[PDB]
């Protein structure tokens, strides 16, 4: 007993993570649509290259968090 | 301080491949060097007995290979220096430019999921195209070294008909070399790939590249955990100085085995975009040669032209005879590519879509050297497989120009390369190429974009 | 021009992720030891099924997200 | 309804294995079956002139690829059944029981990125111990099918020596039958895994597997793409009855030329908790016996213990030769491990180390019927690797019962099988096996664990 607690403050973070993510994603899409729209590239290397060290204060599971976001962000490559 | 070669003191073609072949070079031909006909006549002589740089039953396996391609079941990957010089023709540079572009195909083929193809820039790209025939210094053009000199003289950008031979000479030594080296142990995958694992390693951008570097180690690990435990690199340089080819044709039975006519100064040659005149002597000059050929397609191209260029060059219908070299630049192909590939697609020919992201995207930068922007080169593969996804059709190769040395000609990238940074290595005879670092960065994108 | 205005707003999204994900390790951690101080199991499989099917509504990434959450809280299996 | 074997009416050992193995047999042996010894002995009379069931150039290459899992270099996955019957000796049983792991083994290989031994418990698993000699139900214990019927009857439970012949008749049946399928398509790895792509589509916990699943998938199409395009399952069974294995004996030259003494029954056997007396008969058959032998080691074992037996069954330092069978359950084996490993692994001897997270977790349920916890079995197969782990030493393999059914022995799993549940598909005869699902989900887990 007593575990419970925080598999409450889990089911917080996780759904409050969840709604931020949600919400990064068409962040990204809107500077997607928004940089194409002046023939831009669809992507920034350089950029992606700040994103991903963002995220690793996280360890080495950080870039791969960070590239998760991105793909969420920007999508697939080639697709 | 030169050598000297002994003028000779071959057998005859069939009726017809003499005529096709003499009304071919008859047509008008852009961009030939200016020289004695005499001169390069007794060149042309030399090359005539030459032992070949390639022969027939290669090429026939890469048209076998590059059919495969067409079809949808590989993928080609060409690529090396943009110009051949022969000041750089040396092992050290043969042998990073071979390592480069085998480190570049393991990370293709496992994205790919399917064969790679390698052809190189290599053994015979000694000749360029020139807009203008006055360059920058009011001086004659510098046209690749098979015709005149990159020294900034007057007396160097004669064009030299000796030069031929000096060509030839140079390329044969280079692919003894790429033969050597391809069945050594340069061309074992692992060793490949510990390459790859210490440009992780020691890249700024090593955490982009990473968990993908590790899924081909994974790969390659399980190959040798079943049981397993060499490599094919083809030469091709675009066809530009007829001279040059016609002295390098050997008459072969072939494919049919009837007699054809081999082009053996390469595997593969293709045709430029300041060349491709459709009643021109090198689209002709390509209609009677067994070699695959490739056609550059700018962004002036009508799906109807490249229909012409598919029923002139793959008149049998032979799936990978043809490959269509598509340069647009980034803000262009998603909007032009696909038409042509409709209607293309449509004439029942198989023909290779094969991306450049090069020669659509370069620009005079703020430093005086001509430069590209790594996130323009990837933008424009990008779209060429996001077109390619949308109809179904097959996104059958890149072809970029590369150095096995780490030089600064193009912008971007993991080393965020900079127009300041231009001018510390700009090695390049004449455009810029993808530094080792820029190689490997594109051809893990590039694999990305492969996956699903 | 004014991309820079969520460019903020993504740069804002991230850390704030990353505090959600840098505090979420933990607890998770904390779950960790606690059902381990008394004969229990490192992990718990039934689990970690309810949170892959948390992120679910990101699409095929959910799953992947999810995993990295696990790894960060009840580190990598075998290790 | 029944079938009639004559009595027959081979060649003398030397001297020496003639002593040493009428001594070991001497030797007191733990819960063998009461049965005439005069019909027993008409019985091994007919086993002693049988086609073997392996030969010793099968067992000499199991020791070549155990000694390859001894010094770290590949990795043993033991699996199948708990206890075969002669009524489930069927080709959909057989079929499924291979199928299933051929399937954690593609799995277990990517993840240890070397190869895995496959060795299949079947082909003479006709025999267990019992802790009581007298059942739930007051009746004589059931001891395996080589000894007497799972059948709920007095007369059922009556020890049969017939069962000996049955249990060859059954066993080499069997072996042919997996000698056909590890031969077929069935083993193309290919095959093979796309049975696992099924399994993830059709699973209720597919999205834990998913990734890894398609990881392996472009590991074995880049396989392909590189020009690649046949298995080995081994028989073993826990060697309880000393008569079976007498009469499965056969002479020949072994790893050093000279004369040796290989049990035929299987190619490696094993020695459990329950009868590893140290100077008993069991211990000592091990040792006259070229097979790769086992010892299950459960928590009351010692550190110094575990040396004799290494000490008594490797004498002569032969790595892979004997493999210890940790089974302590998951609240024990992080604890109790350790000091045993790092004391054998004191004595310069190179023995694999296999996990068996069934046999230490097994507990009563509420509904009557015996059963584990699928997040028990997990926790002490972690617990394992991460004491080998922490010491530098191999985590060699796993030993797990399972079957290619959907049955439901075991809780838990992607199934959240229910005590309620263990009701709807109780197949087994003995131990509750982890179902199809259980299976390749642990091979999924334990791959996990073997990446880093
Ligand atoms: O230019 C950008 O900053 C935006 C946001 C983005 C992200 O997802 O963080 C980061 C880099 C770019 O490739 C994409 C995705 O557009
Ligand atoms: O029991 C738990 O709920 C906690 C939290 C956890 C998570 O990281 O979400 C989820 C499942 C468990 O395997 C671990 C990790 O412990
Ligand atoms: N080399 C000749 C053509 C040729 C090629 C091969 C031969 O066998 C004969 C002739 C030319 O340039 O015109
Ligand atoms: N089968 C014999 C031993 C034996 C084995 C092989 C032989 O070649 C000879 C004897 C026994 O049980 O005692
Ligand atoms: N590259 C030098 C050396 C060389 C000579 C002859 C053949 C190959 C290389 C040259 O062009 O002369
Ligand atoms: N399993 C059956 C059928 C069988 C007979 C003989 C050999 C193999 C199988 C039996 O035990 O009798
Ligand atoms: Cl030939
Ligand atoms: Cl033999
Ligand atoms: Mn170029
Ligand atoms: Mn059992």
Redesign the interface.
């Given at each position: 007993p007593?575990?419970d607690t925080?598999?409450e403050?889990?089911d917080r973070?996780?759904?409050?993570?969840?709604a931020?993510?949600?919400?990064?994603?068409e962040?990204?899409k809107?500077?997607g649509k928004?940089?194409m729209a002046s023939?831009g590239?669809?992507?920034?290397?350089?950029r992606?290259?700040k994103?991903?060290?963002?995220?690793?204060?996280?360890g080495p599971?950080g870039?791969?968090?960070?590239?998760?976001?991105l793909?969420?962000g920007r999508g697939?490559?080639?697709? | 301080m030169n050598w000297t070669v002994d003028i000779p003191i071959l057998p005859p073609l069939p009726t017809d491949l003499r005529t096709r072949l003499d009304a071919a070079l008859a047509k008008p031909a852009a961009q030939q060097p200016t020289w004695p006909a005499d001169q390069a006549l007794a060149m042309r002589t030399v090359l005539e007995s030459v032992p070949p740089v390639t022969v027939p039953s290669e090429i026939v396996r890469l048209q076998e290979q590059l059919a495969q391609v067409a079809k949808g079941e590989a993928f080609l990957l060409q690529g090396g220096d943009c110009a051949e010089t022969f000041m750089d023709n040396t092992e050290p540079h043969i042998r990073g430019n071979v390592r480069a572009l085998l480190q570049m195909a393991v990370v293709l083929t496992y994205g790919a999921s399917m064969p790679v193809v390698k052809v190189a820039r290599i053994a015979g790209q000694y000749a360029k195209p020139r807009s203008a025939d006055i360059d920058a210094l009011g001086l004659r053009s510098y046209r690749g070294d098979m015709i005149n000199g990159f020294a900034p003289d007057a007396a160097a950008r004669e064009h030299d008909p000796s030069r031929l031979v000096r060509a030839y000479a140079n390329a044969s030594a280079a692919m003894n070399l790429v033969r050597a080296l391809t069945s050594s142990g340069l061309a074992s995958l692992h060793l490949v790939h510990d390459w790859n694992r210490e440009f992780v390693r020691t890249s700024p951008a090593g955490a982009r590249y990473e968990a993908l570097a590790t899924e081909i180690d994974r790969g390659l690990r399980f190959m040798s955990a079943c049981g397993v435990a060499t490599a094919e690199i083809y030469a091709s340089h675009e066809a530009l100085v007829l001279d040059y080819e016609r002295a390098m044709l050997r008459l072969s039975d072939g494919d049919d085995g009837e007699p054809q006519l081999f082009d053996l100064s390469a595997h593969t040659v293709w045709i430029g975009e300041r060349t491709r005149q459709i009643d021109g002597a090198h689209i002709a000059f390509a209609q009677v040669i067994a070699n695959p050929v490739g056609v550059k397609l700018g962004p002036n191209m009508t799906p109807e032209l490249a229909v012409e260029y598919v029923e002139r060059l793959d008149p049998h219908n032979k799936p990978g005879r043809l490959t269509l070299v598509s340069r647009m630049g980034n803000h262009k192909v998603r909007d032009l590519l696909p038409p042509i590939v409709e209607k293309v697609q449509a004439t029942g020919h198989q023909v290779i879509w094969q991306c450049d992201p090069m020669h659509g995207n370069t620009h005079e930068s703020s430093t005086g050297f001509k430069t590209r922007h790594f996130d323009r080169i990837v933008d424009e593969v990008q779209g060429f497989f996001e077109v390619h996804r949308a109809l179904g059709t097959h996104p059958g190769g890149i072809h970029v120009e590369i150095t096995g040395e780490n030089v600064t000609e193009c912008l971007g990238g993991a080393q965020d390369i900079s127009e300041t940074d231009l001018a510390g290595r700009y090695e390049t005879a004449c455009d810029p190429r993808l530094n080792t670092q820029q190689s490997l960065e594109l051809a893990f994108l590039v694999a990305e974009m492969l996956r699903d």
């Open positions: 007593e575990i925080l598999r403050e889990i973070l996780d759904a409050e993570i969840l931020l993510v949600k919400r990064r994603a962040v990204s809107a500077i928004a940089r023939g590239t669809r992507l920034v290397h350089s992606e290259m994103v991903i060290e963002r995220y690793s204060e996280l599971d870039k791969d968090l960070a590239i998760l976001l793909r969420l697939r490559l080639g697709h | -």
